[PDB]
Design a binder for this molecule. Structure first.
Ligand SMILES: *[B]([O])([O])[C][C]C1=[C][C]=[C][C]=[C]1
Ligand SMILES: OB(O)CCc1ccccc1
Lengths: 8, 97, 131, 131, 97, 8
């Protein structure tokens, strides 16, 4: 968790 | 108007309940965490939203926008609900429902 | 947020916007599962609000998102409405969210976790950009 | 308003609600003429914004509301965005309102007038009823 | 949500700027007028609307909702723009456009 | 000004 596919 | 149609973001440092108190005195409780005072601030409409910090390459929820400066001053820290102090309750709720 | 910047759409996929029955943004929220969202208690959410997920732009004539109904609201009973202490509410969805490259969950810390003063954190939302 | 009362519909006829383009309520205002509204400078009003007169229930399925376009915004040049001092703006109506049992203007005081400490006044709005 | 669909009204006493200073100290400047601290408070969303008092059988604009309690506390006075202080600017504007 | 048709 907390792993966007689209990285901030 | 001053509302963003577009999701906005901002980086800010966490404060020690100690330092936060220099600004809010006794209004600062155990289940609260301060961030900001650095030139950015949460404001009207950001309430209930996340405060996240990275731990082990992952975004983890440390805060929830709670209250702050009546004017959203960028030199006054925002106050956040401290998830750490309230997590046992979330997990237990989750476990029972 | 005042003095913030636009985010890359999709990049904070747990971020939700709660809308009231009229139709618009009163508060923010965070998905922790495809069935639960965490918010503040002071937001007074009710079985009548709606949770919107996958949203980036609030002015689209029509955008590709997901409006979720709330089955039950769970306020922290320790919530102090004069003190604002224990400001948190759990929202149990009636229709679970559909995770994808733009909707997914944040990680929850442990009661014993330590986040030291001085750590650079991030906050996001649709609040005012100027008082 | 926290701990207010519901108003008799149409009894505070200069009361207006400003809406942004996405469509909803961000601030209050007061009609001082058929062509001008006064509101706060902190509201950040712009000509994209619309003034809604004649409103009671922001839910009203449909009413005899009047939506007005704003020709020019007049922001007091002394407005302090840090102190919030001189908080006022004037809005000049692209098109004038049509006064009626429900829409009409409030009176303006003189710089020399004295409202004594303790005087019973009234405030109105659609803001939060609870924090 | 905590947002009403119907218009709210609340009656409240005006305060003397030195009683107000008690509560907000130094943030209270020249063009500000306080009212409340008596069981009501304006809250987020009220901004820009009126504070009116009756004079000669007529309602007059004495305040413009400006900022107040970070929590809308019904025991803290709200701060309104004082019209008195700004109406010469208004009249000149009107006279001129 | 200041006298509503509808009385508060
Ligand atoms: B909430 O949306 O009602 C406002 C919460 C807030 C937090 C910090 C600073 C300003 C406002
Ligand atoms: O913009 B606001 O926060 C609405 C005005 C106000 C706020 C808080 C307290 C009093 C008045």
């Amino acid at each position: 968790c907390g792993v966007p596919a689209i990285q901030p | 108007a001053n509302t963003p149609d577009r999701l906005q973001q901002a980086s800010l440092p966490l404060l020690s309940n100690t330092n936060c108190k220099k600004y809010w005195g006794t209004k600062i409780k155990d289940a609260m965490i301060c961030a900001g005072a650095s030139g950015v601030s949460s404001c009207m409409g950001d309430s209930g939203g996340p405060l996240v910090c990275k731990k082990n390459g992952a975004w983890t929820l440390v805060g929830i926008v709670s209250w702050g400066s009546s004017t959203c001053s960028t030199s006054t820290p925002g106050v956040y609900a401290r998830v750490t102090a309230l997590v046992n309750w979330v997990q237990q709720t989750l476990a029972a429902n | 947020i005042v003095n913030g910047e636009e985010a890359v759409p999709g990049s904070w996929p747990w971020q939700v916007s709660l809308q009231d029955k009229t139709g618009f943004h009163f508060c923010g929220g965070s998905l922790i599962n495809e069935n639960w969202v965490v918010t503040a208690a002071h937001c007074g959410v009710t079985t009548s609000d709606v949770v919107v997920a996958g949203e980036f732009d609030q002015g689209s004539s029509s955008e590709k998102i997901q409006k979720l109904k709330i089955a039950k609201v769970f306020k922290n009973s320790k919530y102090n409405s004069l003190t604002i202490n224990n400001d948190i509410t759990l929202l149990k969805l009636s229709t679970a969210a559909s995770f994808s490259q733009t909707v997914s969950a944040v990680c929850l810390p442990s009661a014993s976790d330590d986040f030291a003063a001085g750590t650079t954190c991030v906050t996001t939302g649709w609040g005012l950009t100027r008082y």
